[PDB]
């Protein structure tokens, strides 16, 4: 009788486990990079801007006010890494230019 009770409760638990796994995904795991889930779980102990850049372009897009705020923050971070790459290339160009100027003055 206890075995049949457990079998009936496992059959009831199967539909519950399928329903609570088929809820709204809420941007679930196995979809972000390493650094996003490491910042989720806290204390990453190793920051690296290149992996943050390569993983922030991998996150998808989507109480709709917090959804609009998330998409606005996503556009903001996209503009951040865009300006970062632009500034890095321009800084390399400026450094080459002033290296030529320093060579001429010396």
């Amino acid at each position: 009788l206890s075995k049949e009770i457990y079998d009936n409760e496992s059959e009831l638990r199967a539909s519950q486990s399928q329903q609570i796994m088929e809820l709204v995904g809420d941007i679930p795991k196995y979809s972000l990079g390493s650094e996003l889930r490491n910042r989720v779980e806290g204390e990453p102990q190793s920051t690296s801007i290149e992996r943050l850049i390569e993983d922030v372009l991998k996150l998808p897009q989507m109480d709709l006010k917090v959804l609009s705020e998330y998409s606005n923050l996503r556009k903001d971070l996209i503009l951040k890494c865009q300006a970062l790459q632009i500034g890095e290339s321009k800084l390399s160009d400026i450094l080459s230019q002033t290296n030529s100027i320093n060579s001429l003055t010396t």
Binding site: G33, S34, Q45, R51
Partner: protein
């Protein structure tokens, strides 16, 4: 249910006695000090007791009774340390098996792992399946990382055979101990999943025949200059023939000249004194089977090798299948050539010892390994 170091298993005491009797006294002193510093049981007051015991010149039996009857198995971490020190001491007992680490298209991936964060990740991946305990140390001489993975079962906890996975420091080739049970596939697959963390890695095995020691497999397939030459090209893996361009030119092989012997190219071997010519013949055999100049054993002892020579005469594929055996194959082959049984003028490169411990076929004069 990931077991910590303070848990003690249920094993027989006499087999731990037999294992701990295979160690010297100073490593036993270091083990007692480290275990009492980490766990203790029955500060510096009990240290001078063993300091006075090792000064009197006691045997190993009274000190192994001391260590087995001030802790009375000890724990899982103490057993891991005992077995790993036994691995360091006698390396000829184990048997390694290499496996490459591919990713993406097929380009090899260097592991570049760190010993801190890898261990908890491997343990939290393995604990969702079985009871497990991992332990990872650094080899004191060779620059590798040996990881001892131990598993358990419930009929309290019956132990399993400990599974070893040896990581070299900067190579895409990962050695593991030879097993084929489902626990071996589980541990290797779990390591292949947890070492990646950015993009997925798979472990295609590069060899099927096991090799004996860790120095031998490190010299064969680790990060080393001997990793590909290994045979008659052993001179290029040590560079004993040339000096730097900033060296003298008076002591140069172009200026001094090396004593050589005129080879024979007609079939003058099947028709069969001067000890300088005998010394030059032994030097020729030493050149062909080894580098420049015991006395028969090679750099690495190879256990088993199976060749296959698929030539092609008048559009007929003529295969033969050489197979070898024994302790050191190419050393015994150099010995058989040294007794003038094998004509060294017609010994090809693949038989001579190059691409050692690789049993593969030959299709028109260029070696290739087997999967």
């Amino acid at each position: 249910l990931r077991l910590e170091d303070n848990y003690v298993p249920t094993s027989d005491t006499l087999v731990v006695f037999k294992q701990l009797m295979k160690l010297p006294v100073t490593v036993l002193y270091d083990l007692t000090l480290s275990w009492f510093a980490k766990f203790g049981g029955s500060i510096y007051l009990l240290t001078e007791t063993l300091d006075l015991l090792i000064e009197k010149g006691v045997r190993r039996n009274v000190i192994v009774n001391r260590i087995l009857y001030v802790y009375w198995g000890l724990n899982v971490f103490q057993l891991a340390e005992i077995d790993c020190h036994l691995m360091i001491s006698k390396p000829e007992k184990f048997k390694w098996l290499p496996s490459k680490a591919l990713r993406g298209d097929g380009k090899p991936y260097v592991v570049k792992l760190q010993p801190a964060k890898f261990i908890e990740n491997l343990q939290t991946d393995l604990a969702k399946i079985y009871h497990c305990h991992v332990y990872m140390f650094k080899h004191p001489s060779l620059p590798v990382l040996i990881t001892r993975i131990q598993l358990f079962d419930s009929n309290p906890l019956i132990s399993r055979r400990p599974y070893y996975v040896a990581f070299p420091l900067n190579s895409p080739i990962i050695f593991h101990s030879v097993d084929k049970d489902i626990y071996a596939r589980l541990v290797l697959q779990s390591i292949s999943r947890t070492i990646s963390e950015r993009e997925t890695i798979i472990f295609k095995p590069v060899q099927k025949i096991p090799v004996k020691s860790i120095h031998n497999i490190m010299t064969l397939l680790g990060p080393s200059r001997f990793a590909e030459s290994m045979g008659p090209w052993e001179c290029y893996a040590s560079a004993n023939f040339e000096r730097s361009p900033l060296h003298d030119y008076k002591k140069h092989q172009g200026l001094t000249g090396k004593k050589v012997m005129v080879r024979e190219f007609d079939d003058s071997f099947l028709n069969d004194e001067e000890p300088e010519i005998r010394r030059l013949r032994l030097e020729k055999n030493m050149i062909k089977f080894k580098g420049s100049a015991s006395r028969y054993s090679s750099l690495v002892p190879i256990e088993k090798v199976g060749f296959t020579l698929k030539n092609e005469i008048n559009s007929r594929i003529i295969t033969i299948k050489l197979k070898f055996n024994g302790n050191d194959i190419f050393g015994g082959l150099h010995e058989l050539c040294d007794k003038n049984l094998i004509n060294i003028d017609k010994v090809p490169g693949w038989l001579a010892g190059e691409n050692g411990s690789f049993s593969g076929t030959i299709m028109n004069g260029d070696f290739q390994r087997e999967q």
